[PDB]
Structure formats: structure tokens, C-alpha cells
């Protein structure tokens, strides 16, 4: 009743009073203001110069309720723009929040965890500053228990989420030592039964694997690929999405790292992923496939054994344009490193028609890719004297009829590739 709908000035009045209880009430009012459905007056609160006051209340062990209120208020301010988050950091909140992680009051240390999450999530710089202030040990200590299941559901979700932000951002990526520190715990969270924890854990792994092969390696080295393939089959889209991104990232690495997801049985899930109702999953899955077709011939052979070429043909034939483009890539990569027998199989699966149909697309990049593929296939037929038979097939379904049309195309690389095909393989 007395902390509902206060005006910023009343809040300032109470916070500036010489009464701790008056400050507590004013702070709770500030918090409720910052927690209203929409458009919380974050800037008004900031201009009033309240951040420094809140930060100081964080250090009042004697009055844990004001620690909590100011923590919640600061958390919400920190959830705004970079400028608003900067305001919190500039108030000296980082060290103060790290100290609260040790609080005896779970709901208070949890608020500190959340705030640290908002601060780190802003970007690389604040992320690394939080780490430099020593946040990782306290955070990890909060999860150092025999069974994660004994922790409050929300409490676990907040730590997991905050840890995933410490793994987030790329320019630069989190410090290597910090990653190593966090990884073990992350590996444990990846085996927890709560879906939100799994989703955020997968997001964390997806961030760590979004980079150079050395980065992917320290993750693969932890033995999480199998757990990821498992989560890849999850029924909850919020889990499958980040899991698929992690698996997709890992196969952008070395052939050896890519072999790890294959050995884990990832390919068996793709007939489903490649036909997934969610356009995005379908796109990420086809992209993931494209990098797998850019691997060794024995890996392209796995794609073949799992019967995934027909699914690629299917996705090249009908799907969101972005997914089709990813399909084009998977094909051009496949033809590029595949054996003759494998390229013949691709043709036998019906790759030609859908491939030709895309040549009518308004996108110079995809056309280049498709032309490349056409070239790669002809080169395989060249090795069998079947070049002619191929020309017919491409001829049979308006293929040549489209390559000539592009022979006049504007793009440098295009008309060239176009031309060569018309002469070197036709008339």
C-alpha cells in the first residue's frame, strides 16, 4: 500500500532521509516502480542520482531487506541499454554484487547472480570486468553441491543463465582460463533434468563453440558431444535450437572434431531436423549438413548411408529460401569433395531438377554456388564419358535454357561460369 506507485521524488525523499527504515521503504518503492509491466522509469531513477545510494545499500549486511530491494532495483536498471548498464557498473556495483553471492539469504545472493548476469550480458568488456572482479569462483561455489536437484528451481536457472552470459560474446571471446574454469560445471548442468537449465546450458556451449578450432576443442575435449546429440533429439524446441547450434558450430571445426558428432550418432536425427516444422531448425540443420558435406569422403559417405541425400534433395526442392541456399551449399560442397560414385548417387537421387530450378533465383551468391556444383558434376561425368548424358538431363528440365539466360548475367563471376558451361559441355 505504502510502496505502490511512488513518484521518483518521493523515492528520493525517503532514500535521502536519515532513517534506515525510511530508506528501505523508499528503496522497495523504487523497486516496484522498476518492476511495472512496461516502460519502467530507468532514466528518471538514474538522473535522480539513486544508483550510488542503491550500491551502498548492497553492503548493508545488518539490513538484508534493503540489500535485496536495492539489488532488485539495480538488476532491472542493469537490464536496460548499455548506457543504463554502464550507470550501474560506474556506481561500483560489480564488487558489491560479488560480495552478495556469499549472502546467507538465498534470494539475495540469487539477485546478485541475476544482476551479474545483466552486467555480463551487455558485452565483452563488462563480461571480462565481472570476471576480473572475481565472480566465477563465488558463482561456481553456489553450484558445488552433491545433487543439483536440491537447489531451488529458479535459483538453478539463474546461475545457469548467468554462467551462459559469461560464456557469451566474441570480440574478444571469454578468457581461456575462465572458460576452462566454468566448463566442468557447465558439463554437469548439461545433464540436469530441468529443460530451462538444459536450454541455457546448450546456449552456453553454443557460444563457446562459436569460434576458432582451439575453442571448439576445449569443449569437445570435455566429452559433451554425445549429450548434445541426445538433447538434439529433445522434444522441447528451446533445447533443440541451441543444441543444434552447438553441433553446427562444432562441425565448422576440423574433420576430426566433425567426426565426433558423427560418431555420436548425430546424423540419425537429421531426417527429422531437415523436415522440422520450424523454419529456423530446418535452416540450421541444412547449414550443419553443408559443413558435414565439406568434410572427408568417408564423412560424405556417412551422410549417404544415413539416407540424408534424399532429404537434401527434398530441402533443395521445397523450403524457405534461406534453407534452400544452405542446401545449395551442401550440394556444392558434396560435389566438391565427393567421389565420382558419390556424385553419381547424388544425381540418381534427383539433385538435377531442383538444382536447375534455383538458377532462376534473384541472388548472385546462390547462383555462383549452383553453377559451381553443375561444374563439379560435369567434371565427374567427364571422368565417365557421360558428359553428354548429363547435358541431356540438364537439357530435359530447362537447365541449359537457364544457363544461357545467365550467360548474359551482369555479375563478373557468373556470366563467365555460365559461358564456359555452354561451350565446354554443350553445342
Amino acid at each position: 500500500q505504502g510502496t505502490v506507485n511512488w513518484s521518483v521524488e518521493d523515492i528520493v525523499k525517503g532514500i535521502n532521509s536519515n532513517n534506515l527504515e525510511s530508506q528501505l521503504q523508499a528503496t522497495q518503492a523504487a523497486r516496484k516502480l522498476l518492476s511495472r509491466e512496461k516502460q519502467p522509469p530507468i532514466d528518471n531513477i538514474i538522473r535522480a542520482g539513486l544508483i550510488p545510494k542503491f550500491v551502498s545499500f548492497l553492503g548493508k549486511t545488518d539490513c538484508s531487506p534493503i540489500q535485496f530491494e536495492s539489488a532488485w532495483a539495480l538488476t532491472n536498471i542493469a537490464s536496460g541499454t548499455s548506457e543504463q548498464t554502464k550507470a550501474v557498473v560506474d556506481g561500483g556495483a560489480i564488487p558489491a554484487f560479488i560480495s552478495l553471492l556469499a549472502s546467507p539469504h538465498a534470494h539475495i545472493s540469487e539477485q546478485a547472480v541475476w544482476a551479474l548476469g545483466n552486467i555480463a550480458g551487455d558485452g565483452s568488456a563488462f563480461r571480462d570486468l565481472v570476471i576480473k572482479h572475481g565472480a566465477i569462483d563465488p558463482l561456481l561455489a553456489l553450484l558445488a553441491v552433491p545433487d543439483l536437484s536440491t537447489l531451488a528451481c529458479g535459483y538453478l536457472r539463474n546461475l545457469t543463465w548467468t554462467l551462459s552470459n559469461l560464456c557469451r560474446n566474441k570480440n574478444p571471446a571469454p578468457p581461456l582460463d575462465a572458460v576452462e574454469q566454468i566448463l566442468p560445471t557447465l558439463v554437469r548442468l548439461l545433464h540436469h533434468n530441468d529443460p530451462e537449465v538444459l536450454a541455457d546450458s546448450c546456449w552456453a556451449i553454443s557460444y563457446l563453440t562459436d569460434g576458432p578450432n582451439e575453442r571448439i576443442e576445449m569443449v569437445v575435449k570435455k566429452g559433451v558431444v554425445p549429450q548434445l546429440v541426445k538433447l538434439l533429439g529433445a522434444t522441447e524446441l528451446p533445447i533443440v535450437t541451441p543444441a543444434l547450434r552447438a553441433i553446427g558450430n562444432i562441425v565448422t571445426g576440423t574433420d576430426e572434431q566433425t567426426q565426433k558428432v558423427i560418431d555420436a550418432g548425430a546424423l540419425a536425427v537429421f531426417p527429422s531436423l531437415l523436415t522440422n516444422p520450424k523454419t529456423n531448425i530446418q535452416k540450421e540443420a541444412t547449414w550443419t549438413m553443408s559443413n558435414i558435406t565439406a568434410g572427408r569422403q568417408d564423412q560424405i559417405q556417412q551422410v549417404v548411408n544415413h539416407g540424408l541425400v534424399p532429404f537434401l534433395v527434398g530441402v533443395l526442392s521445397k523450403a524457405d529460401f534461406k534453407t534452400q541456399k544452405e542446401a545449395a551449399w551442401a550440394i556444392t560442397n558434396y560435389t566438391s569433395g565427393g567421389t565420382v560414385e558419390q556424385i553419381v548417387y547424388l544425381v540418381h537421387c534427383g539433385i538435377i531438377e531442383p538444382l536447375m530450378n534455383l538458377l532462376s533465383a534473384k541472388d548472385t551468391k546462390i547462383i555462383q554456388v549452383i553453377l559451381d556444383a553443375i561444374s563439379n558434376i560435369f567434371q565427374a561425368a567427364e571422368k565417365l564419358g557421360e558428359t553428354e548424358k548429363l547435358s541431356i538431363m540438364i537439357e530435359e528440365c530447362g537447365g541449359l535454357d537457364k544457363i544461357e539466360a545467365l550467360q548474359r548475367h551482369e555479375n563478373e563471376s557468373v556470366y563467365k561460369a555460365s559461358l564456359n558451361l555452354i561451350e565446354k559441355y554443350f553445342s
Binding site: 545483466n118 550480458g121 551487455d122 546456449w203 553454443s206 547450434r245 565448422t252 547449414w287 556444392t332 560442397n333
Partner: peptide
């Protein structure tokens, strides 16, 4: 030619969370 990095949005999780 080969591996093409994961590039472009997603869009991933929100960077921050306001507590209602």
C-alpha cells in the same frame, strides 16, 4: 573450399532480463 562459419542472427537469447 569447405567450412562456413555460423554467421548472422538466430536470434539468440536476450542479452538481459528484467525482473517483473
Amino acid at each position: 573450399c569447405g567450412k562456413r562459419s555460423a554467421e548472422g542472427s538466430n536470434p539468440p537469447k536476450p542479452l538481459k532480463k528484467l525482473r517483473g
